[PDB]
Design an enzyme around this catalytic site. Structure first.
Site: not given
Ligand SMILES: Cc1n[nH]cc1NC(=O)Cc1cccc(Cl)c1
Ligand SMILES: Cc1n[nH]cc1NC(=O)Cc1cccc(Cl)c1
Lengths: 304, 304
Positions: B41, B143, B145
Site C-alpha cells: 500500500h 506511518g 506500516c
C-alpha cells in the site's frame, strides 16, 4: 492507536555489553569508550557476600584477574578502580559501538528500559518504573548483575541503572552508573528493608489520558475534585500526593484530550473508591503506574 | 526471579529498518541482503485505499519512484515485484547489517516482538501475541506500516509479521514476509470482520506456572480436573479448548514445579469461575495469555 508497555530499541545498548569474570564470578559489564563498568561484587566469592570488605577484596586483584570479553574478543585491562559500588576497568581499546551517552540519576516514579543480560549476552528488553521506594520489579536471575537501565532521546542513551541485587522479598536493587545505590540498599547478602512503596499518581493519570486517546473512556464521569480532596483519597489508597508540578507535567495530555487534570483526578478517585467492577482499561484490570506523562506523549505521537 | 512482558533485543532488526517513499506515501521497509520488503500500500494515495487495484497502481511505478533510505544513505532500486501484499524492491547493495534470518509463518497463540518504526526509524519494542483470530493488539500509529514482528533463536531472526493495517475496531492486521495476510483481512480501507477471539489457554497455564516459579502461589488449590471437565469451563469462558498437545508442551513446566498439568487446569477453572477476588498474579489482575510455555522457560532460565 493502541497502547503497549513499550521499551526503547535496545540496539545501542547491546553493542556495549560485555562479560566480566573475576575468579569464579561472572557478570555483565557496560563498555563505553575505553572503560568497562560492572558491579563491584564481581570480586566476591560465596563466603564474602555475607559482609564483604570490598576494599580488601579488591587489593588482592590485579588488572589481569578481570577477564573482559565482548562476544568472541578479549579486552586488555590496563586499570581498575572502585567508585562506590561499581568497578571501572580501563581497557586499551575504545568500544567502536559506543553510542552518544550520558550517565544520569533518575528520580523515583520515572521509567526506563532494561536490557537483561547473562554472560555479556542480551536475553530480552522490558520497560519498568523506579518505584517510589527506589526498588524495581524486574526480571533478573543469577548472573543478570551488570544489566543496565536506560532511556534514549534521539541518538543519546542516558544510562540510569545498573542491576546489582535481588532482595529476599524478590524485588530488585541497583545503582546509578557512578555506583550509588538507589535507596538504602547495600551490596551485602543481608535482609534489607525497602521503604513503604506507594502508587505513582501522576503516571496513573497519564495512563488514564492514554486510555482516553486510545478509545477506552468508560471511566470518565460527570465529577470533578480538588488537589486537597483528591489527596485525602490518595492518602487512603497509598498513592503519591498530587502536586501542582504533577498537574503542570500533565498539561499536554489535558490539552490534547480537553479533560481538565482535576476532572481526570475525579475519575481516578471514583476508580479507587469503587474499583473497575470487572472491566479493563487498555487491557489491564488494575491501575497502571509505569507510564509517565512523557512516555504517553512519546508513544501516542510516535517519537523515534 | 521476577516475570516481565519481555521482548527480544531489537538490535539485529534495527540494522534492517529503512524508509520507503513512493509518491506522497512513506512507510517502513525491511532490508535483508539486497532486497527491501515493504507493504504494497506504499504505492497508494488516499483516493486509492478504498478499493485499490494494486496491479494497475504498480504498473504506473518504476524503480526510480521507490525512494529507499537507510538513515542518511540512499539505496539504488534495480527491481520491483509484488508478492501477495508485499513489495520486494531489489537494491544494488546488500545490507551489511543483515543478520542470519528466516521468514516464518507463526501460528495463532504464538508470541513475537514488534519493533515499532516511523520513517524507517525505531521508536520502541514490545512483546505481543498473535490472537487466535489472527489480529494483534499492538501500538501502531499512521506511518508504522512496515514495522515487523520477529523471534530470535541465538543468532537467527525469524521474521513472522509485517504490519499493514489498523481495522476500524482499533486492532491490528498484517502479513507474513511473503505478503500473506494473517486472517481474512485485505489491504483495503473497508470494515472487516475479525473472527470471534478466544483466550489462549495453554499460555494462561504457562503463566500460572511462571507465577508459581516466581513466588505467587495463592491460586493453587486441593483440586484436580479432566480435559473434558476443564473444556466445559473453557467453553463457557471463551477459552481455547485444551488438547493433549498443549498438555505435552506444558510438560517441562509441570516437571519443574511438580504440579501436574490437570492440577494447574483446576486452579485455572477456579480462577475462571470465581475471579481473582481483588488479588493479583505476577502484577496482573486478569489472566494473562501472552506468554507461551517456551517464553516462560526461556525467561525463567535466562536464555540469551
Ligand atoms: C538472583 C538475582 N537476581 N538479580 C540479581 C541476583 N543475584 C544477587 O542478588 C546476588 C547478590 C547477593 C547478595 C548481594 C548482592 Cl550485591 C548480589
Ligand atoms: C492508523 C494505523 N495504525 N497502523 C496502521 C495504520 N494505518 C492504516 O491502517 C492505513 C491503511 C488504511 C487502509 C488499509 C491499509 Cl492496508 C492501511
Amino acid at each position: 492507536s493502541g497502547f503497549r508497555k513499550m521499551a526503547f530499541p535496545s540496539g545501542k545498548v547491546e553493542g556495549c555489553m560485555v562479560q566480566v569474570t573475576c575468579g569464579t564470578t561472572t557478570l555483565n559489564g557496560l563498555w563505553l569508550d575505553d572503560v568497562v563498568y560492572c558491579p563491584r561484587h564481581v570480586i566476591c566469592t560465596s563466603e564474602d557476600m555475607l559482609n564483604p570488605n570490598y576494599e580488601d577484596l579488591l587489593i588482592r586483584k590485579s588488572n589481569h584477574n578481570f577477564l573482559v570479553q565482548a562476544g568472541n574478543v578479549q579486552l586488555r585491562v590496563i586499570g581498575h578502580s572502585m567508585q562506590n559500588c561499581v568497578l571501572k576497568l580501563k581497557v586499551d581499546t575504545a568500544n567502536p559501538k559506543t553510542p552518544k551517552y550520558k550517565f544520569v540519576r533518575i528520580q523515583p516514579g520515572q521509567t526506563f528500559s532494561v536490557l537483561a543480560c547473562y554472560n555479556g549476552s542480551p536475553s530480552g528488553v522490558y520497560q519498568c518504573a523506579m518505584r517510589p521506594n527506589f526498588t524495581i520489579k524486574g526480571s533478573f536471575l543469577n548472573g543478570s548483575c551488570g544489566s543496565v537501565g536506560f532511556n534514549i532521546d534521539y541518538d543519546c542513551v542516558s544510562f540510569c541503572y545498573m542491576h546489582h541485587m535481588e532482595l529476599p522479598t524478590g524485588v530488585h536493587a541497583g545503582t546509578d552508573l557512578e555506583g550509588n545505590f538507589y535507596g538504602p540498599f547495600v551490596d551485602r547478602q543481608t535482609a534489607q528493608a525497602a521503604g513503604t512503596d506507594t502508587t505513582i499518581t501522576v503516571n496513573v493519570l497519564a495512563w488514564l489520558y492514554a486510555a482516553v486517546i486510545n478509545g477506552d473512556r468508560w471511566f470518565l464521569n460527570r465529577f470533578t475534585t480538588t488537589l486537597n480532596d483528591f489527596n485525602l483519597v490518595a492518602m487512603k489508597y497509598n498513592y503519591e500526593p498530587l502536586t501542582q508540578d504533577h498537574v503542570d507535567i500533565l498539561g499536554p495530555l489535558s490539552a490534547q484530550t480537553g479533560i481538565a487534570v482535576l476532572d481526570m483526578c475525579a475519575s481516578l478517585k471514583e476508580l479507587l473508591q469503587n474499583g473497575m467492577n470487572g472491566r479493563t482499561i487498555l487491557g489491564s484490570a488494575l491501575l497502571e503506574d509505569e507510564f509517565t506523562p512523557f512516555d504517553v506523549v512519546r508513544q501516542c505521537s510516535g517519537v523515534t
